[PDB]
Amino acid sequence: QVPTRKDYGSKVSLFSHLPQYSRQNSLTQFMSIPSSVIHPAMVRLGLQYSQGLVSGSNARCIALLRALQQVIQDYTTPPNEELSRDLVNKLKPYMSFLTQCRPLSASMHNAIKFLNKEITSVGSSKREEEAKSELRAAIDRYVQEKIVLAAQAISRFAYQKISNGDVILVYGCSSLVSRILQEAWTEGRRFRVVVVDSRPWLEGRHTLRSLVHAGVPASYLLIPAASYVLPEVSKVLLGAHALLANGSVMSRVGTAQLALVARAHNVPVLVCCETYKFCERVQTDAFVSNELDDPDDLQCKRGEHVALANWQNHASLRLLNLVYDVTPPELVDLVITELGMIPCSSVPVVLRVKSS
């Protein structure tokens, strides 16, 4: 079957319950060529997941749904079996392999739940090709409604909250935030954007380029200097990887810190997120559920010496590369969704109306 990826390095005691892998160490080195137990599309998708070729939550969800469409297209039913059960039982090992390559995002989990519900809803009397075409169409419609129209509606809503001459502070890379800012500039709003970035990913640079290509004036700085720039900031706009049932915002590490520092400077905090990223689970801190990236990414060349080189030689030394953090609902002023302008406490309400 599929072997188990080996943990890399020594983990912090408080984070010993979470996996921690190495970027160089791939899993497909122990898998057959051509791939038999795992569909080739899933193998390629996991390969680009583990190497970080696709990183955004929306991008990861879109790539996963495209790979699932390819798998459904290549799928055939076995004799004396049902489509609804066999497809799910065949997809389960693929999702396990993908999780082994990299822990699944919340949007990925929601997409998996939606696809499983759609497959289970396929009638037994339905023809194979008709069922496959219907599944592909359902995946395409899900992508459309949950991404494109949602982003358009969120941008339309956020246009009303952006005024001429204000300063908006953004963090990291978020397609929704960049799209919102681009349309806001296009419709005629005149403003400037402050971009905040953090090591080691430095994803914010991406957004910076987008702004430079849109004509929007922009500024760049690292997260520790955020407290220096917030006095001139009029509002903070943040993307979200997930919204939890208690109203807390699960996002890239440093988002909660930025929200706290903005609260200390009396500036409003707005979080933009599509409703398909809402989660029924709850989480009070960043320790119980999180992702451990490659610790070797923390090594930086300052001058001619790398201080963290061969850090595993020291027995007591540990390297922590946290991926996500949780912002409490009391640190978020407004949430912008495709449904409208709602507070954090309304997150469960949406979860009640989307399900039924």
Binding site: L334, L339, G340, M341, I342, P343, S346, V350, V353
Partner: protein, 294 residues
């Protein structure tokens, strides 16, 4: 068409003057429904446009948040009624019937709020109020009718001394009341046991839009761990999301040096809201607004 702007303004002012107890939003909704009674239209599109223009001119008459809240609520009611019936005649009959029922239901919200809120007043308690409010007067009347003894403090509301009017109205039923300055809110906060205020409009996130001095009293009560209760009717639920004091629309601040007439109070500064729907947390207002608009 029928009942041009002059007649609409005259009817609104006559309804306001004939019954001073009736609130501005109730009078506006009555004027809109009585406009609906005589429209002589054949399509729902022109009806909606005419009602929107009527709401526009009515809000031109009165710059209160409650009038706009009633206008939006009436528009949503018309849309909901149109959603069920396609024929315009049957839809209009259903709209008239439902509007009469709606007027009957909203005419008695104050008594329900009083009956649900007077229980929170204790014997020998010290009640702090901000300005004149019919709902606060009604809840205090209901508490007095319950053979309960309490004292009331009220600010003078310098722009227009409605605090003096509230003090006289409270003395009318033999309630020990005191009048303090608008600058004496922090000084007298330590003597009050709980704070009860009204609201001209309830915003989406659970905060309230109220007289200019409400935010100071809410912040002072928060700094001293005093409960802050808001009595407000259902028809004052606005789908507005101000981020700060400057984000409040200017059509409500002025014409009702720099002298704004209203301010916004965040939901985190409010303990409970007493509405005709019941006793609610500020989070329930957003749920209600979401449920109303599909």
């Amino acid at each position: 068409g029928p009942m041009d702007d002059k007649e609409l303004i005259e009817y609104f002012k006559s309804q306001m003057k004939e019954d001073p107890d009736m609130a501005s939003a109730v009078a506006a909704i009555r004027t809109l429904l009585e406009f609906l009674k005589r429209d002589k239209g054949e399509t729902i599109q022109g009806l909606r446009a005419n009602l929107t223009s009527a709401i526009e001119t009515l809000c031109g008459v009165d710059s209160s948040v409650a009038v706009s809240s009633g206008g939006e609520l009436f528009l949503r009611f018309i849309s909901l009624a149109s959603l069920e019936y396609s024929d315009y005649s049957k839809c209009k009959k259903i709209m008239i019937e439902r509007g009469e029922l709606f007027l009957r239901r909203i005419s008695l919200s104050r008594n329900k709020i009083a009956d649900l809120c007077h229980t929170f007043i204790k014997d020998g308690a010290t009640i702090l109020t901000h300005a004149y409010s019919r709902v606060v007067l009604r809840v205090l009347e209901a508490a007095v009718a319950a053979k309960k003894r309490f004292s009331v403090y009220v600010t003078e509301s310098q722009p227009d001394l409605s605090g003096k009017k509230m003090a006289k109205a409270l003395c009318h039923l033999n309630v020990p009341v005191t009048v303090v300055l608008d600058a004496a809110v922090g000084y007298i906060m330590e003597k009050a046991d709980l704070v009860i205020v009204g609201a001209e409009g309830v915003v989406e996130n659970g905060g309230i839009i109220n007289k200019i001095g409400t935010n100071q009293m809410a912040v002072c009560a928060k700094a001293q761990n005093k409960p802050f209760y808001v009595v407000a009717e259902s028809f004052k639920f606005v789908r507005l999301f101000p981020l700060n004091q400057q984000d409040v629309p200017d059509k409500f601040k002025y014409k009702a040096e720099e002298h704004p007439w209203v301010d916004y109070t965040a939901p985190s500064l409010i303990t409970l809201l007493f509405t005709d729907l019941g006793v609610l947390t500020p989070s329930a207002v957003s749920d209600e607004l979401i449920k109303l608009y599909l």
